[PDB]
Structures are given as C-alpha cells and as structure tokens.
C-alpha cells in the first residue's frame, strides 16, 4: 500500500485498502473508514457490474435521481475528489464575510457542511448535493468580485465539474 493518504498526501495513522494500494486517514476517506475496500474500489465495482452505466447521460436526468445507495456512493466519491485538491482548503470550513464593498451570501455553504449533510442522509436527490456544491463556488465568485482570489473558486469548481461529468458519465459535448 501507499505510505501517504490518497486525499491529503500526508503520512499519519493510515488505513489501507485491501483491494488496491491506496491508503487513507480515517476522516479523509468518505464515508469515514469503517477486509476493507476503499471508495475508489467500490465505484470501480459498480462500473464493472453494469458496463452500460458508462454510456452517456443527460445532466437533467442525473440530477433528478433519487439518492439510492449507488447515487449516495457516487456523490460521496465526487465530494472526495474535490477534497483531493489542495485548494479545497479554502472551501472546507465555515466562511465569514467582512470585506469593504461586498456583502456576504444569503446562504453560506462549505465542504464540511456538505460532508455532514451526506453523512446524515439529508439529500433525497442528486440535485440537492450538486446544488450545494455549486453554491460554494458561486458564493465565492460573487463575494470576491474583482479580487484575483475569485480565481480559486473557478479552479475548484472546474475540478468538481470534470469529476461530476466523469463519475456520472455525462454525455460528452463540444
Ligand atoms: Cl470563499
Ligand atoms: Zn488525509
Ligand atoms: Zn481501494
């Protein structure tokens, strides 16, 4: 197995996958680490049991799906892919807003709040999860305005959207 956490790339108390060489801190894995197979493995098994699941889909159909166990897993994995990027640190914990010339968002949102909501089964459809994730980056863009720091929200949103299209097999388009 790897000697560093797959998500944050640090050493420490690591739990090892039994079906692949990845390792994880307890609370870096999503769900929190519970023979054991990691979320990467579990996602791969879904694809292998249903190869047609990789044919292209419409985003509108994906968003209306109820959060059954396989969609719950795919959202957990998508959330984990965002935490895998180091720039997720800016969006992980609860933000506060006191900048001259700006007003904070009406509905603040952050990654650890989405993690908790997933863990507590608060989303009934994929749309709920995706709306909250996109809201993180939209709030950031609106608040920081012309500050170059706005770019961090564009960057991490791009990671979210690329992984969304991959994990839920969104039909490729020009
Ligand atoms: Cl922010
Ligand atoms: Zn970690
Ligand atoms: Zn694994």
Ramachandran bin of 9, using left for φ above 0, alpha for ψ from -120 to 50, beta for the remaining angles: left
Q: In the structure encoding, which two tokens stand for residue 172, read together? A: 């490729």
Tell which residue, 101, 112, 126, 86, has the closest CA to residue 32. Answer: 112
Which CATH number do you get for residue 154? 1.20.920.10
Are β-strands 23-24 and 15-16 bridged in parallel, bridged antiparallel, or unpaired?
A: antiparallel
Q: How far is the CA of 90 from the centre of ligand 1 (A)?
A: 6
Q: In the structure encoding, which two tokens stand for residue 150, read together? A: 């706005």
Q: Is the dihedral of CA 47, 51, 56, 61 positive or negative?
A: negative
**Buried b / exposed e across 144-169, counting CB within 10 Å, b at 16+?**
beeeeebebbeebbebbeebbbebbb
Report the structure determination method. X-ray
Beta strands in the chain (DSSP E): 15-16, 23-24
Q: What are phi and psi of 23, to 5 degrees?
A: -135, 160
Q: How far is the CA of 25 from the centre of ligand 2 (A)?
A: 4
Q: How far is Cα 167 from Cα 84, in angstroms, rounded to an integer?
A: 15
Q: Do residue 80 and residue 134 come from a single domain?
A: yes
Q: How far is the CA of 76 from the centre of ligand 3 (A)?
A: 15
Nearest bound ligand to CA 18?
Answer: 3
**Buried b / exposed e across 29-48, counting CB within 10 Å, b at 16+?**
bbeebeeeebbbeebeebee
Helix (H) or strand (E) holding 159: helix 150-167
Tell which residue, 170, 173, 171, has the closest CA to residue 74. Answer: 170
Tally of domains in the chain: 2
Q: Do residue 12 and residue 72 come from a single domain?
A: no
Nearest bound ligand to CA 145?
Answer: 1
Q: How far is Cα 104 from Cα 160, in angstroms, rounded to an integer?
A: 23
Q: Do residue 101 and residue 171 come from a single domain?
A: yes
**Buried b / exposed e across 65-102, counting CB within 10 Å, b at 16+?**
eebeeebbbbbbbbbbbbbbbeebebbbeebeeeeeee
Q: How far is the CA of 16 from the centre of ligand 3 (A)?
A: 8
Establish whether the linkage from the previous residue to 158 is cis, with ω within 30° of 0.
no
Q: How far is the CA of 53 from the centre of ligand 3 (A)?
A: 20
Q: How far is Cα 158 from Cα 160, in angstroms, rounded to an integer?
A: 5
Which CATH number do you get for residue 48? 3.30.40.10
Residue 25's domain comprises 1-55
């Amino acid at each position: 197995n790897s000697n560093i956490c797959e998500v944050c790339n640090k050493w420490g108390r690591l739990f090892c996958c039994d079906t692949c060489p990845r390792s994880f801190h307890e609370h870096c894995h999503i769900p929190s680490v519970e023979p054991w197979s990691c979320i990467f493995c579990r996602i791969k098994t879904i694809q292998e049991r249903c190869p047609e699941s990789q044919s292209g889909h419409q985003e509108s159909e994906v968003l209306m799906r109820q959060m059954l166990p396989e969609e719950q897993l795919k959202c957990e994995f998508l959330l984990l892919k965002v935490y895998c990027d180091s720039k997720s640190c800016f969006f992980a914990s609860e933000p506060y807003y006191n900048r001259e010339g700006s007003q904070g968002p009406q509905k603040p949102m952050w990654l650890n709040k989405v993690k908790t909501s997933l863990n507590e089964q608060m989303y009934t459809r994929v749309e709920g999860f995706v709306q909250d994730m996109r809201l993180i980056f939209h709030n950031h863009k609106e608040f920081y305005r012309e500050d170059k720091f706005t770019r961090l929200g564009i960057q991490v949103q791009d990671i979210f959207e690329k992984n969304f299209r991959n994990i839920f097999a969104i039909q490729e388009t020009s």
